[PDB]
């Protein structure tokens, strides 16, 4: 009915705002990225700092794992993405093509591809092996805030400050759908685990669950504050079925997915919680905050 997330660890080390936290698909690791130009790896269960991965010339907005938990991709203000071998810490490829800040990135399920979104208003599809750009989608007319592959990688969902959420056929690069809604900036977008729904944040303090096939809004989640930052949200699926998001009032919000009620609010951070991640098997949340805080928090619940 209601989760009971409690603080287990506070992870200090970043020297500027943290931008993104992600659990490795194998559950073993947390990766974090920051305005400090660094990627850090931490033990998911003991919160133990593992290593720092460096190479970007400017700050990093996003980081994402390959399906085998061996590779990471990062998205940076230096206009590049970098592909990293986590075990060695080495940059395997630098992905060059965007003409401004890169804000978001993801591997596909196979992990032969990377998708990216940029201030330059494009979505790019990259070949992991060669490090070359396969497709450039003229996706939006303002900065791209988020990009995400569906369950099998056949679709890409993108969001933008232009107020649109668009769905793309990965193979052809063709737009399959623009969600019909007002047009406040769409600050975040993610497919549901089954690929049927899309969770979308807009900068009017609102999260929406969309039915992809129908192009219809099914659920709305409110009560939090989100009018300025591109705050990441999540489907929590290991215990109760929740929606999880950071907020500009420094809290982590948790809603019941079906009823839309706020079921928990997590207090502790001292700046905007820009990023949250949900562990793939345990009832564990990671959260991260902006420059007044600079820490990552790990929380655990019984359900
Ligand atoms: C006009 O659009 C933007 O300026 C913009 C959009 C999305 C961003 N992301 C996208 C990915 N999230 C995980 C983090 C926030 C970000 N990145 C950040 O807000 C951000 C936060 C902390 C550190 C950081 O270092 C570059 C960047 C910026
Ligand atoms: Cl496809
Ligand atoms: Cl689902
Ligand atoms: Cl789908
Ligand atoms: Cl997650």
Swiss-Prot record:
**What keywords does the record list, in alphabetical order?**
Acetylation, Chromatin regulator, Host-virus interaction, Isopeptide bond, Nucleus, Repeat, Transcription, Transcription regulation, Ubl conjugation, WD repeat
Result of altering residue 290 to A: Abolishes histone H3 binding
> What Pfam families has UniProt attached to this entry?
Beta-prop_WDR5
Report each WD repeat as a residue range.
Answer: 13-52, 55-96, 98-138, 139-178, 182-222, 225-265, 268-302
The impact of changing residue 209 to K is:
Loss of interaction with RBBP5 and reduced ability to stimulate KMT2A methyltransferase activity in association with RBBP5 and ASH2L
- Indicate the transmembrane segments per the record: none
**Residue positions, PTM N6-acetyllysine:** 82
What PROSITE patterns does the annotation carry? WD_REPEATS_1 (PS00678), WD_REPEATS_2 (PS50082), WD_REPEATS_REGION (PS50294)
Q: Does the keyword Transport apply?
A: no
Recorded hits in Gene3D superfamilies, A to Z, give: YVTN repeat-like/Quinoprotein amine dehydrogenase (2.130.10.10)
Site entry: Important for interaction with histone H3: 77, 103, 232, 291
Tell me the first and last residues of the signal peptide: none
- GO cellular component annotations, sorted alphabetically? ATAC complex; histone acetyltransferase complex; histone methyltransferase complex; mitotic spindle; MLL1 complex; MLL1/2 complex; MLL3/4 complex; NSL complex
Q: List the Gene Ontology MF annotations in alphabetical order.
A: histone binding; histone H3K4 methyltransferase activity; histone H3K4me1 reader activity; histone H3Q5ser reader activity
Instruction: Tell me the outcome of changing residue 103 to D.
Output: Strongly reduced affinity for histone H3
Q: Which InterPro entries match?
A: G-protein_beta_WD-40_rep, WD40/YVTN_repeat-like_dom_sf, WD40_repeat_CS, WD40_repeat_dom_sf, WD40_rpt
Task: Reply yes or no: does the keyword Ubl conjugation apply.
Answer: yes
CDD domains referenced in this protein's UniProt entry, alphabetically: WD40
Under the heading SMART domains, the entry gives: WD40
Q: Give the similarity note.
A: Belongs to the WD repeat WDR5/wds family.
Q: Specify the protein name.
A: WD repeat-containing protein 5
Gene name per UniProt: WDR5
């Amino acid at each position: 009915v209601k989760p009971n997330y409690a603080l287990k660890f506070t992870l200090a080390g970043h020297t500027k705002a943290v931008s993104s936290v992600k659990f490795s698909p194998n559950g073993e690791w947390l990766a974090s990225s920051s305005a400090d130009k660094l990627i850090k790896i931490w033990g998911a269960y003991d919160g133990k700092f593992e290593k720092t991965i460096s190479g970007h010339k400017l700050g990093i907005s996003d980081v994402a794992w390959s399906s085998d938990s061996n590779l990471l991709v990062s998205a940076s203000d230096d206009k590049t993405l970098k592909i990293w071998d986590v075990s060695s810490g080495k940059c395997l490829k630098t992905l060059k093509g965007h003409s401004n800040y890169v804000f978001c990135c993801n591997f596909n399920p196979q992990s032969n591809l990377i998708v990216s979104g940029s201030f330059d208003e494009s979505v790019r599809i990259w070949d992991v092996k060669t490090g070359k750009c396969l497709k450039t989608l003229p996706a939006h007319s303002d900065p791209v805030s988020a990009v995400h592959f569906n369950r099998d990688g056949s679709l890409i969902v993108s969001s933008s400050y232009d107020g649109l959420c668009r769905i793309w056929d990965t193979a052809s690069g063709q737009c399959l759908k623009t969600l019909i809604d007002d047009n406040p900036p769409v600050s975040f977008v993610k497919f549901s685990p089954n690929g049927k729904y899309i969770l979308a944040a807009t900068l009017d303090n609102t999260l929406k669950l969309w039915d992809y096939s129908k192009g219809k809004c099914l659920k709305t989640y409110t009560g939090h504050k989100n009018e300025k930052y591109c705050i990441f949200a999540n489907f929590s699926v290991t215990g109760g079925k929740w929606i999880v998001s950071g907020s500009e009032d420094n809290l982590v919000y948790i809603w019941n997915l079906q009823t839309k009620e706020i079921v928990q609010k997590l207090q502790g951070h001292t700046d905007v919680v820009i990023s949250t991640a949900c562990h793939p098997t345990e009832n564990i949340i990671a959260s991260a905050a902006l420059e007044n805080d600079k820490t990552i928090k790990l929380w655990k619940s019984d359900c």
